[model samples]
Target: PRYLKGWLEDVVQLSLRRPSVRASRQRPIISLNERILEFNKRNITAIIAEYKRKDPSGLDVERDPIEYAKFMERYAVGLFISTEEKYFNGSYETLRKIASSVSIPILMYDFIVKESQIDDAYNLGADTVALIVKILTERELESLLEYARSYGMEPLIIINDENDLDIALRIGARFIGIAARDWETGEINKENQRKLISMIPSNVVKVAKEGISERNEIEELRKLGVNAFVTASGSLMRNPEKIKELIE
Candidate 1:
């Protein structure tokens, strides 16, 4: 409950500083659903590589966002940009820049606690946005999902456990992510990952996020019905060719 309260407070402070705009007439740059289907048709694991200055462990990332987006275009199914300023050192400007420059779909990887943030993502040209089930109330999640769809952007719900998965399904989330990293320790828990998979419905687009490193791990999870993966760039950025191995 402490983490929920802390995140909610952060949302409140952020909303106060958030600028108001006449309703944005912006639209999605690309179709996320079509992109996912393209990967599905090819029987390839959709790799949604994240762009951030640092990971949760505070490790510094060296790749430039624009260049990295271009490099990943060869193999990645989509692009993720973290807009959370406090933890990931992410900014909306960075997301906007990448989304505008890249032809591929861009997912706004932020702790979206309110509807205004959804609008912000759409206005910034993001094709989709993230909503973590761990932090939001069911009502909040449903509302955010509805709002996200209204703007022609899909919402990807982040699930940490069975309860989160249940809430996501109840709210009709088409895209869901099972995070392998534990929130408290920032460590990869394979047991948690395996457990979360059982909770996901087969009808939805399943995504595996965090702590996925090796090509063998991707192959193993692909067999288990995971449609996509959201991996932080370090090795992938250094060797863009590694994506071929992961997808294969």
Candidate 2:
């Protein structure tokens, strides 16, 4: 909790300095949830390639956001742009730039805690914004989801445990991401991860949020009924063309 709490504390300050742009409904709303469902229906790997410029690890990317957005567009089913500026080196301008260049659904990836942030997401032509349950209270989550829905951008609600999932379901979340890593202690215990995912209703979208790297790993996740997976800052970014193998 301390680690995530530390990040949230920083997010608080980041929010105050966040871009002051208002939602202009600049582009037609594309449904991220629907896109994933379409991939599932067609049996394609719905890998949401992200445009995160910097990696906390060592692979600091410096590609043009729009140009790279098109690069990742070929094999990926969707795009995820980490708009948080501090650690990820991403910004609303980059997200806006990328969304304009690509037709694939774009996720405004950030530690969202305010309505203005959601408005920024909409204004930037993002298909959806992330609402991590651990980052917000149940009441806050509900209100944020409500606001996100009003803009026709179905929010990507994320959870790592049963309680969070329960709150997520009660709020009628359409797209739910079960974070692969245990946020509290860090390494994933697949047994707990397996059971928690099983608890998710089959009708609701089941997303494997991060930690996916290989086709075999993705195959295992698919066998467990995962509808989609998120891969970022790994082979996907390092060897963009090599991702064709992962999508296979």
Candidate 3:
């Protein structure tokens, strides 16, 4: 007989005591459908810059959120609303406002686990939500993503390893994120990353997410057949206009 004890106690308790959670009825205050259409029309030649529009913590000087948003509007670029270093409060609404102010799409990146986060995503006016494939179970992930789909929200699934590629395809995720930097060592595994990208279906719009800090690297990856590219440390954290120019 299988006895639930020792190391399995927590797992058994969690299964027996887990609370029921509700599905989200909230809709995005600012929809990205229009922006997404625009970007697609451009054939994925769009750059999404991330920055702090506003924060009460007096952390980083925003330089100018309005200016940044205006510039994106002028160039028809996308903007990602991020709270500085994962302290993502108030920033979601701020990104929505800036996006609305400029008429662009906003992708929400934060620690997401519950329907509450989805409700908050609706309130913040995000057009897309990021799902970290490293942490979710196959069943749990499919259920949450399906729920998001029901709300007309797009899912951007992040993949850090080769196995995640299979899961990403199974979920019918259009937006795929590939991480090259080892989260533990902060070092890049460029060979593996390139190999993994090569394994993807040519039709899939795979976006490389980590340690991708060079234009040559992006162009090189293009040789391997990936069409989409995403970078924070290289593009967003630095010169966004250049990123926009380079993507084109």
Candidate 4:
């Protein structure tokens, strides 16, 4: 199995081992849904910049959580703070530090296998959390959504194809992530990527994730009703002007 697929199995095993952990009751000051809608209304691509230590290939990338937060404050809709320990090498420390420093919404990107994980994200001050449809059943997805609402954190459902998209829609997931790349096999499905926008309701904030490397792709997706894009900060970090250009 690919590393990405292994990570999900690992998360599920870990969550099963620890079930008594309670999430923090503390709430965030700003609503991530509101901020995303605000950006969507402007005909701008909502950039969900990812902060990670490495890619799936295990390649290292130099990143400072606070620095990424500062950059997103001006050019993006939200910050995706990955907390996956093995593959991404992320930690809650970066999430805490970024939340303390930035006013923008924070997105906790990880293999969230249980409701406790969602609760933990809220306690860490995460304004949003990612949920991959491939790793969850319909009932589990619905339960997680309900749990997220209880804490005021929006659930960003990551979808790969029509089946996943249908589930997100039927379950009333407002924030949707259309991942072009499959996490299990690390394969990109161009057809699914092309058709996802048409399937999602225009009212939902659709975020195009993975396999996006150019500014033109962002522009093209924006034209197709995608409100946001999630990408690693490597290129944007090198050329900050790209952020401004995409937004403009």
Q: List the candidates ranked by lDDT, beginning with the highest.
A: 2, 1, 4, 3
Model 1 RMSD, rounded to 1 decimal:
2.6
Sliding window of 10 residues with minimal summed lDDT for model 3: 1-10
TM-score winner among the candidates? Answer: 2
What's the lDDT for residue 197 in model 3? 85
Each candidate: what lDDT? 0.77, 0.79, 0.59, 0.75
Q: In the order shown, what is each candidate's alpha-carbon RMSD?
A: 2.6, 2.4, 7.0, 3.1
Per-residue lDDT over 1-248 for candidate 1, one digit per residue giving the tens place of the 0 to 100 score: 11444545675466446663344434455867568878999877788877777655647777788998988888889988888777677888887778777788888887777777787888888888988888777888888889988877778889888888888888899888888876656777878887788667787888888657877777778777888887644566566677778777
* Model 1: lowest-lDDT 10 consecutive positions: 20-29
**Model 4 stretches with alpha carbons more than 4 Å out:** 1-5, 18-29, 237-241
Residue 52, candidate 4: alpha-carbon lDDT:
73
Error of 4 at 162 (Å): 1.3
Q: TM-score of predicted model 4?
A: 0.88
Cα lDDT for residue 82, model 3?
63
Candidates arranged by TM-score, highest first: 2, 1, 4, 3
Tens-digit lDDT string for candidate 2 (139-173): 88889999999988888898888888999999999
Instruction: Give the better candidate number (2 or 4) by lDDT.
Output: 2
Residue 220's lDDT within candidate 4 is 75
Root-mean-square deviation of Cα positions for candidate 3 versus the true structure, in angstroms: 7.0
Candidate 2: count of backbone clashes, pairs at least 3 residues apart or interchain: 0
Candidate 4 lDDT, tens digit per residue, 104-163?
A: 888888877777677677777788788888878888889888898887667889988889
- Candidate 4 local lDDT, residue 64: 70
